[PDB]
């Protein structure tokens, strides 16, 4: 939509359900902790 389709989905990670070493540190902060 407000951004071309497919954008933001990394070939070597999201597209293969693979996580990078520290992305969970980010998602864990989108709640209340840090």
């Amino acid at each position: 939509g407000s951004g071309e389709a497919d954008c933001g989905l990394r070939p070597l990670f999201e597209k293969k359900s693979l996580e990078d070493k520290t992305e969970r540190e980010l998602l864990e902060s989108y709640i209340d902790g840090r």
Binding site: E4, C7, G8, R10, P11, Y30
Partner: protein, 250 residues
Amino acid sequence: IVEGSDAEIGMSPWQVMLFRKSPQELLCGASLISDRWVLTAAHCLLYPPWDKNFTENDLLVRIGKHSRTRYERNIEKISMLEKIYIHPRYNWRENLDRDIALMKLKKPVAFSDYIHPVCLPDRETAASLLQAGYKGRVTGWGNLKETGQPSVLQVVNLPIVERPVCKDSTRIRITDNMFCAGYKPDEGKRGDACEGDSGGPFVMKSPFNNRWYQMGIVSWGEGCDRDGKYGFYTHVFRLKKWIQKVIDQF
């Protein structure tokens, strides 16, 4: 980047290096937002106090990189600039307000495992993700300390800081078009962007659709990773309309 660590392969496929033709050196960071457009900080191109004022032909855009100095044959893609657009109201004279610029590539770049565009935030996404305490990611090949350089692309995860706290850390006049990020003195952890990271992307991964969005652009700071001070970034969404305006017309 100070106190960060080596990024892994294909971790930031939108990461762009602004390379100078002569001499040949790292100039700034930038980001790929489509097959023909790259985003960066205006002070990277224009900054009179330092007689800095580059044009289309003084620069090269290098996409898909990991190593700072090597020419990554078969992996990276070097592209030329067709046109540069600085924000008409970029304030280099006072506080670097509206530190943003768009660059039009001469020819579309072909995506791959190492080259892929990041997403631009929309009102909803920015509203939900841009909050104090939430962490974003900054990447670059800039300095490792205030006063050498990394061998490989560096990455750091930093929390966004409360606007009031940003205002009381500097004598510089803050504006709505910027936000600051970093750890406070008593938070144990540290880290920050630094000279050479300018124009680099500050991104966040949406918990809703799993996509990575670019919320900021490495803009300025006073020193690097000093206690009590924070890094400032251009508020990408606040300037989103200037962006679409430019892309839809040019």
